[PDB]
Design a protein around this ligand. Sequence first.
Ligand SMILES: CCCCCCCCCCC(CCCCCCCCCC)(CO[C@H]1O[C@@H](CO)[C@H](O[C@@H]2O[C@@H](CO)[C@H](O)[C@@H](O)[C@@H]2O)[C@@H](O)[C@@H]1O)CO[C@H]1O[C@@H](CO)[C@H](O[C@@H]2O[C@@H](CO)[C@H](O)[C@@H](O)[C@@H]2O)[C@@H](O)[C@H]1O
Ligand SMILES: CCCCC/C=C/C/C=C\C/C=C/C/C=C/CCCC(=O)O[C@H](COC(=O)CCCCCCCCCCCCCCCCC)COP(=O)(O)O[C@H]1[C@H](O)[C@H](O)[C@@H](O)[C@H](O)[C@H]1O
Ligand SMILES: CCCCCCCCCCCCCCCCCCCC(=O)O[C@H](COC(=O)CCCCCCCCCCCCCC)COP(=O)(O)OCCN
Ligand SMILES: CCCCCC(=O)OC[C@H](COP(=O)(O)OC[C@H](N)C(=O)O)OC(=O)CCCCC
Ligand SMILES: [Zn+2]
Lengths: 75, 268, 30, 26, 233, 262, 70
Amino acid sequence: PISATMVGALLGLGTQMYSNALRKLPYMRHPWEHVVGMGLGAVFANQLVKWDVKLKEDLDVMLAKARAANERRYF
Amino acid sequence: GTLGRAIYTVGNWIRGTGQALDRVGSLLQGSHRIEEHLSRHRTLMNVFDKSPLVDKDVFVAPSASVIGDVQIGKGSSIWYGCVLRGDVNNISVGSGTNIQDNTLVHVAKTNISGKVLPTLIGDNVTVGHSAVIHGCTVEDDAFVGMGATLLDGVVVEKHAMVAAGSLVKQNTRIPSGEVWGGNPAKFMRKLTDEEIVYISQSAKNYINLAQIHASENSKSFEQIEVERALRKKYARKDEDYDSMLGITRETPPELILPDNVLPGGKPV
Amino acid sequence: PKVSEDKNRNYAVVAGVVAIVGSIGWYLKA
Amino acid sequence: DKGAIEILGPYGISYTFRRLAERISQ
Amino acid sequence: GTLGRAFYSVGFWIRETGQALDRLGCRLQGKNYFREQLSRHRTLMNVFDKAPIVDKEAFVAPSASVIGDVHIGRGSSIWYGCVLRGDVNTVSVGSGTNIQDNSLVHVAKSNLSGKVHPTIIGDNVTIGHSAVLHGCTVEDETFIGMGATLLDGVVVEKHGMVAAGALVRQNTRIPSGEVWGGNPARFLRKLTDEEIAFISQSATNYSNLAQAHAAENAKPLNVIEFEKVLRKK
Amino acid sequence: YFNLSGLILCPVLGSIILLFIPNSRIRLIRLIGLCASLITFLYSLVLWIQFDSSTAKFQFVESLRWLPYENINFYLGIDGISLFFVILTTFLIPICILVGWSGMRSYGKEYIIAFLICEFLMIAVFCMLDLLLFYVFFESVLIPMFIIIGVWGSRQRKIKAAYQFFLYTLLGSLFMLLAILLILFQTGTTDLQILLTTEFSERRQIFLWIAFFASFAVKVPMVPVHIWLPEAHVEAPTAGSVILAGILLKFGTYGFLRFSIP
Amino acid sequence: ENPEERDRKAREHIYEMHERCKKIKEMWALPIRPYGFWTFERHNAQLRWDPQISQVAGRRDPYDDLLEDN
Ligand SMILES: CCCCCCCCCCC(CCCCCCCCCC)(CO[C@H]1O[C@@H](CO)[C@H](O[C@@H]2O[C@@H](CO)[C@H](O)[C@@H](O)[C@@H]2O)[C@@H](O)[C@@H]1O)CO[C@H]1O[C@@H](CO)[C@H](O[C@@H]2O[C@@H](CO)[C@H](O)[C@@H](O)[C@@H]2O)[C@@H](O)[C@H]1O
Ligand SMILES: CCCCC/C=C/C/C=C\C/C=C/C/C=C/CCCC(=O)O[C@H](COC(=O)CCCCCCCCCCCCCCCCC)COP(=O)(O)O[C@H]1[C@H](O)[C@H](O)[C@@H](O)[C@H](O)[C@H]1O
Ligand SMILES: CCCCCCCCCCCCCCCCCCCC(=O)O[C@H](COC(=O)CCCCCCCCCCCCCC)COP(=O)(O)OCCN
Ligand SMILES: CCCCCC(=O)OC[C@H](COP(=O)(O)OC[C@H](N)C(=O)O)OC(=O)CCCCC
Ligand SMILES: [Zn+2]
């Protein structure tokens, strides 16, 4: 399927070549920073997914606390 | 010390790895690209036991090619891309006579017409860009326009002008004071005194202009780097911060041209 | 000529090597 | 089309924003 | 084809990475000699697969620029300052010819004008100084004058002389033995036997002179000059 | 197994590949664009073959989370109504590419890229089963068509026609978006399968129906808003008119068939 | 597609979507100010700090220091 690693690598390569294009340079000007960008994009995508899971868990906990606080109004 | 030696060894390893990668990349290219080599172009070159006699003050551009029996007088200049091939016969450039960019001066085979004579360019003459000279005898204080072609046997007399984009046919003499031009190279009009003043002023201006090019085309690698750093450092200015600091940054003398090449001699 | 002379540049090289090694260890040890 | 629909449309008379946006300097 | 171009571009990527690594290794050692602004001019320049094919016994001046699919016959010579650029099509130079100094023999740069005709040069063909040959085709034993400006679609027949300074318009044929000159090129006179003999002898004269120039250009590069340039104070 | 994901990703890959190709290689751009369009058309034809014609349930359903609480999500599905629209909108694109074959040297890559983005955005419109995202892809077509009308117009009038089209489309769009928001707040979701099983009060049906009609009637010109179609049609490239007449006029009818009438 | 699996998935999707819809509507029903948020421990900090700084000079009962001698 579409994993976070591959979408991150594609986004990193795309942003590196987009930066190269924006400066009127050839797309593959410096090949090493393309690899660096692919690695950074993969890392960022994986960290984003890992953070999203924890963020949803914390939101669920906070909403459970809020619902429990509201429910006590009926006593 | 020891750290410096270790860093030097690491640099050697990195250089070896980089050269190996360059070789591998060249192999993947299919060995189709012709590799750049050291420059084999000789500015001054001998042909038949004959050497050019370029004077000390002459400015010969590195891209020019003074070849064979060429004698060049003081104060003159040979500009970029210009070729003076004097292998077969003699070429004698006079004093102050500049040959401009991409111009070609070549002498005939001493038998193109039976009684051929060498190419004798006079003093204070100026030859326009991309002009072609093939055995003329241009006398001193003359003007040859850019793109003009002078075939063998022609003689441009003193204070005469050849219009730009002309074709002076063989054995054609341009009298003094005329501005002969056109593809048949026929009589156009008489020269005014303002034109003579313009010719002399252009010759002197090119003499004064050759000096900065000569001083720029002969610099060493160390001086070039220093001048590049200074040019980058003084490219943009900030008078406000300098006034706030109480300093006045002034352009170094290496980035100052003589006032004799400025449009109107601007000291400030 | 097998000696790097610039002391300041040598220390920058050492610091860069230490930074790369430490970053690799950080990404591995944790 | 060219008349009532256009005059009451977006540019026959709805271009009063030129006579309305320029007045914002007040 | 397209598969070869991908490998060529990957080769550039790897070569650039290797050069960057070499520069980094030089910088660690304190050297900065890679910053030197050396001339990148190549007398034989290739455009991907299109590379000039120059015969061994052919004089090509070091300042001459030959680019693309250019074929040089045996005994031919490309003198100083010449620019022989054929990339969209081929430039075929025969045997015994002499592209003289500061001459231009190039093919059209775009298909907008139509079809890019290859430039063909016969044998024993004398191209004059500063002559621009733009997509034409000259037969053998012909003479092109100094400053001539032959355009494309032009055929110069055998033993045909183009006068100096002439400009041959597009799609013009110069008949054998006739001299065409002026702007535009028009018939002027018929060639004589003496001029034909001189045309024949000029090719041999330049072929012999090119050997001497090649011998003087093949000498080892002077080391005294190299040392003198190195130490400038 | 041919699903709706690949049919939508094929134009995406086609547009991405052309995005990073030098403009000097005009032949390669045309070949890759045409090949991508043809592959998408064949994919649609294969999707027709495996289409069950005995069930009213949506087929080839795909889901992708949009809101963190799965309130609204990318729900893709086709039925007997929107299958032929998808086939037509994938068939028309290669024809549009072939129309500008001779003159493509002047338009460049931005032409085929614009048409491929158009195809990607129009395939998702006929496949969306979420009311809100149907609006998102419903009114995302403006940017590619705005660029097509303006950049590659015929005369200087191209600026006026683009303004008129864009302004009318916005006026319909936001007045429909308000109704979509009101439905989302009351019902709680924007899923079509849930909105088709929710008993709307009689009073709210007229207001919501009118608000939906405002956006759809513009794209299927009834009477008072048919003054943008002729100008946009005339001031458009030959392939651009095919998109406006072949597909963009089928949004209103499909919108009425899919949302308003049920 | 298997006709049984498709129908089962459709019914399950409708059922779970309705449950999630009810949950989200009840989520939206939550007021911005919870019922007695001043009763929370995070909002009661002066009740725990002032007793610790009760004997600091500048906060003492005037009669407090008059009895600390013995
Ligand atoms: C802008 C590009 C648009 C691309 C998106 C469309 C393409 C679809 C791929 C989107 C994609 C990457 C996101 C890309 C980020 C963009 C790049 C950012 C900039 C980078 C330069 C996330 O997509 C999935 O992520 C899930 C989150 O987990 C979510 O499911 C919701 O979660 C619940 C919450 O708790 C909800 O309650 C519930 O309703 C849903 O179940 C959904 O978001 C979705 O299913 C692909 O999934 C990737 O993440 C996870 C799978 O989870 C995979 O690894 C996981 O690691 C552990 C979990 O930490 C698990 O232990 C492990 O078992 C698992 O293997 C990856 O291998 C890969 O598959
Ligand atoms: C073919 C298969 C392999 C294929 C893969 C090959 C891989 C090769 C191995 C490693 C690649 C290393 C990549 C790391 C690259 C980092 C960037 C290079 C940084 C760098 O400019 O160098 C030093 C700087 O010093 C550091 O401040 C920071 C520099 C610290 C990092 C340098 C340490 C490099 C040592 C690497 C270990 C080598 C171990 C051996 C490797 C070889 C194997 C035998 C030189 O300074 P400098 O003043 O003379 O000049 C710099 C330089 O010109 C530019 O950065 C600026 O223009 C200028 O302002 C100035 O800053
Ligand atoms: C989010 C949607 C997804 C987007 C895709 C994300 C993909 C992950 C990121 C991929 C990035 C790929 C980049 C390739 C690596 C190249 C980095 C080399 C930069 C470098 O060498 O340093 C010097 C400049 O520093 C720099 O250029 C550093 C620039 C950093 C700018 C931003 C700094 C962080 C700010 C915080 C985030 C931004 C705001 C967010 C709220 C270069 O020097 P030189 O040789 O070019 O010459 C002098 C120019 N100065
Ligand atoms: C693996 C090769 C490392 C090669 C490291 C290297 O060359 O650094 C220089 C580059 C380009 O920066 P410069 O302006 O100094 O160019 C200097 C130019 N090379 C020149 O010679 O003129 O830095 C990066 O962007 C890369 C950042 C990511 C670095 C990992
Ligand atoms: Zn000659």
